[PDB]
Symmetry: C5
Subunit: 158 residues, 5 copies
């Protein structure tokens, strides 16, 4: 099917580590959502320092929007995790992915998983469409489409 996002308000909340890669992911989510009809002033962008802040950050972002009379239909937390020499990578990835999944029932809208969990920087670049070789595609576009489809097919109105 072809999903029309013209009636949606979408939230994007991103972490600020690996900023270049973050900015490419967020751009591709935006471009793709506009392409499917979401209005520009209905894409709300918020930020937090690290990926661990994404879930509580997303919950409070959604509550704040609802309280001011501008509820989100869907949220895309975006973060980039690259394995370092410690186990920090594993513990942030694990607890964050699980809390992003469990957030959906707290706030009652879908939440799109926009975390990269890469072993290398180069893998993160390819997944954002910004490697030298352009060897894959920008995953942020996948997240934008999925946000439009999940909000449309499964929103309260559906």
């Amino acid at each position: 099917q072809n999903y029309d996002g013209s009636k949606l308000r979408v939230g994007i909340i991103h972490a600020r580590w690996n900023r270049v890669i973050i900015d490419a992911l967020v751009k591709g989510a935006i471009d793709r959502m506009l392409s499917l009809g979401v209005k520009e002033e209905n894409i709300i962008v918020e930020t937090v320092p690290g990926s661990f802040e994404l879930p509580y950050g997303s919950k409070r972002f959604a509550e704040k929007q609802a309280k001011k009379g501008e509820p989100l239909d869907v949220v895309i937390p975006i973060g980039v995790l690259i394995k370092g020499s410690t186990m920090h990578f594993e513990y942030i990835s694990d607890s964050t992915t699980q809390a992003i999944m469990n957030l959906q029932d707290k706030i009652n809208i879908p939440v799109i998983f926009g975390l990269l969990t890469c072993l290398t920087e180069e893998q993160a670049l390819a997944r954002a469409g910004i490697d030298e070789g352009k060897t894959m595609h920008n995953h942020g576009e996948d997240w934008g489409a999925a946000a439009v489809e999940m909000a449309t097919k499964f929103g309260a109105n559906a």
Copy 2:
């Protein structure tokens, strides 16, 4: 046992990555359910973009069906995950698996675990019964049988 599936309504909801494999798994579940007496018109199929979308999809899918007076007796979320070069496979698989298990208590019907979590494409083909050498069998068929058994034996009425 023989379980009479003629009274059941059953939802299938599938991700849309690895589509050829998905269709074969889906087709396997439907056929087996049809052979246990489930009626063609009582099998409802829905889709989501990726495996991470399955659990919230499945929740909203059940709620929607109940709300129009057509409640699902059991749901079979289906996705195919194949290990790539980052840890995205691990983190999707594990959070999606836990969310599928836990969904059962939120919607009060059995949810059949229809995710493949393969290290290679070929393992995934074999488990959909469509590798060149037909070395295994279509797991879809197992999911289909299990959906009818779990709905019947453990359905809201004994």
Copy 3:
């Protein structure tokens, strides 16, 4: 100590993959509870197809028993998982284990962890007391004993 099991009703519910190992585990559980005085007619056995079905099957098994006025005091879900070549073993094991643990607080009775999580068939056989060399005691027996002790010592009464 000796735990008297004569007043207990115990449910065993088991998956059906690896049936020979399953039957040996269930028989050891039942034999040990018989010898702890649990009565034969108060041992109720149910099945499910796969280990993944154990936690929701056990919940509805307990509910149904309570609803017909024959509540279980304790339940033993039993399944046999053997590592294969995909990660399916790991995901089933991890999510089934945690859900068996979390089940206790929902149905308010102990639930005995009767799940083998083996890398080979021969490990599973051994843990059922039926490998060729008889290298280990049947773990089903321990599950039977644990069910009687947990129900007796930690039961509502």
Copy 4:
């Protein structure tokens, strides 16, 4: 300045009732861990008649057993202020070690909000017997010290510092 700096003070255990509940596999290790936790708490002023000991067959039983232990103690007017569940797990050749450890750890952690008292993590998760003997202060070489004593101290401190009163 802030709330901080380092004083290393003792905590008085004398108003406390403490529960220790232990698995029965690897009994010799278990007995040494328990004795150490009891000894250290007696040294901190917990009275002998206020240390309650209970057992369960294996480590997987520690979480629900600890819950029902604390509920029973409260129902007879003898509430626990803190519980120490103790078990010894040693890697075997299947993945049983890992599934039991992980789901037991997580349920000891989660148990605290249900019964509303601290729960000290008294589980050994060792790759070898030797590792477990050492952390109970009973290897040949006495290479370490009895982690049991740390659990007893940790219990007295958590109950005292963070108790309802």
Copy 5:
């Protein structure tokens, strides 16, 4: 953006193992928050015996604070875990990280993840800024900056 922390009350609660590294992490968080404007008299430091005690110590820390009329706006649990030769490291780290993440909804303030999960003491010293060759930076500072931002941006009040 620039954050004004002058209205904030922040709790720091640290384990006792690897005290020298804990102390450096804690001073880095305090120094950072001071420079963001938090006042000294509004920073409260508590201690627990080990990393395992952080989540429940944090919960009770926040509840005691609120009950005497001085509620925290954010809490920063700090611990330093180093792999040893048993699986103790993995079990503490995993259950502690997940419980710190999940604490946030129980006490309704953000909780910054101040655990080091290091393979070696050397990694830990580097991440508290006190290794011999000063190779990284004091991560306690990122935590302080995170506490101020999450509290300001996502606090109950605004």
